[PDB]
Amino acid sequence: PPTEPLPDGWIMTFHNSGVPVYLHRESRVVTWSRPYFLGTGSIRKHDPPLSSIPC
Amino acid sequence: PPTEPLPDGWIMTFHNSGVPVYLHRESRVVTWSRPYFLGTGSIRKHDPPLSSIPC
């Protein structure tokens, strides 16, 4: 799918497994699914960006 | 798998789709794969926590 931009402070980078991973540089936190800014959206009911849905 | 703790500021919460999602409360950022603290680990070469690997 088309990708939405990453939230502030995040970068998509290569992992040796061959999959991209997403690092928040300042906190040194990693996730394997593209993170996104929810803003004032409803955590329970919102539709995630298509580029952020796993498997 | 056994879960490793979430990094600071994150919470696992329910999404209407029936899947848990992970919210960083202060930044309002969401990811669909459990995030983890990498610390001084190698971004490229580290083994992620088993609870953090998608699909």
Read off the DSSP letter of residue B4.
P
Contacts of A9 in chain B (CB under 8 A): 27
Ligand-binding site membership of B55 (annotated):
yes
Nearest chain B Cα to A14, which residue?
B44
Subunit contact B48:A30, Cβ cutoff 8 A? yes
Furthest-apart CA atoms within chain B: distance in Å: 35
Q: CA B6, CA B9: separation in Å to the nearest integer?
A: 8
d(CA A46, CA B53): 23
Give the bridge partners for B29, in sequence order. Answer: A37, B24
Helix (H, G, I), strand (E, B) or coil at B52: helix
Cα torsion A15, A32, B36, B8 to 10°: value is: 130
Experimental approach? X-ray
**CB burial of residue B4 (10 Å; 0-12, 13-18, 19+):** middle
Contact A4, A51 (CB under 8 A): yes
Listed by start position, the domains of chain B span: 1-55
The DSSP code for B50 is: G
Resolution reading in Å: 1.7
Q: By C-alpha distance, which of B32, B11, B26, B34 is closest to A9?
A: B26
Using a CB-CB cut-off of 8 Å, the residues of chain A touching B55 are: 54-55
Q: The domain B1-55: what is its CATH number?
A: 2.20.70.10
A25, A34, A54, B23 from B39: Cα distances, Å: 10, 20, 24, 20
Q: Give me the DSSP letters along chain A.
A: -PPPPPPTTEEEEE-TTSSEEEEETTTTEEESS--EE-TTS-TTTPPPPGGG---
Burial group, residue B32, by CB count within 10 angstroms (0-12, 13-18, 19+): buried
